[PDB]
Design a protein around this ligand. Structure first.
Ligand SMILES: CSc1ccccc1CC(=O)N1C[C@@H](C(N)=O)C[C@H]2C[C@H]21
Ligand SMILES: [Zn+2]
Length: 139
């Protein structure tokens, strides 16, 4: 579980999105595991606009924040699931770190703000869905 709240937007994993998110849909992308829904209240999360490759992510399965080195956003194969068939997921960033299925949504942050959220994991790895290219979130 976990969301990003910037201005009149809510950013969640598309596989974890609720009925309200779909009733107030702004943009969704299956290949990125992202969904953006509109909000009534004003959100206050700063989105990072950078090329950072080091940051800190929240791990709800360990109740701890972890510093990580992460890859540049890319097309990375993800195995079949109960939400998506086997496919390349775009704008994904991998790091060495603990991830569990319910850790999806945990925020990855650098010194410049929110980078993205936990999307994939397993085998001593954690994958983050990047949100830095979505410039319309700020505007
Ligand atoms: C971080 S979740 C996790 C953790 C350890 C091991 C396995 C998983 C499962 C995983 O990688 N997922 C990928 C996600 C996707 N983007 O397609 C769909 C939901 C099922 C989540
Ligand atoms: Zn940064």
């Amino acid at each position: 579980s976990g969301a990003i709240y910037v201005g009149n937007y809510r950013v969640v994993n598309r596989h974890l999105a609720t009925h309200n998110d779909w009733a107030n849909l702004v943009w969704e992308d299956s290949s990125r595991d992202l969904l953006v829904s509109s909000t009534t209240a004003q959100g206050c999360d700063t989105i990072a606009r950078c090329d950072c490759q080091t940051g800190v992510y929240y791990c709800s399965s360990r109740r701890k924040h972890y510093p990580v080195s992460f890859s540049k956003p890319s097309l990375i194969f993800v195995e079949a699931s109960e939400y998506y068939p086997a496919r390349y997921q775009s704008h994904l960033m991998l790091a060495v770190g603990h991830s569990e299925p319910g850790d999806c949504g945990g925020i990855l942050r650098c010194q410049h703000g929110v980078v993205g959220i936990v999307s994939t994991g397993g085998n001593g790895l954690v994958g983050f869905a990047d949100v830095r290219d979505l410039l319309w979130l700020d505007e």
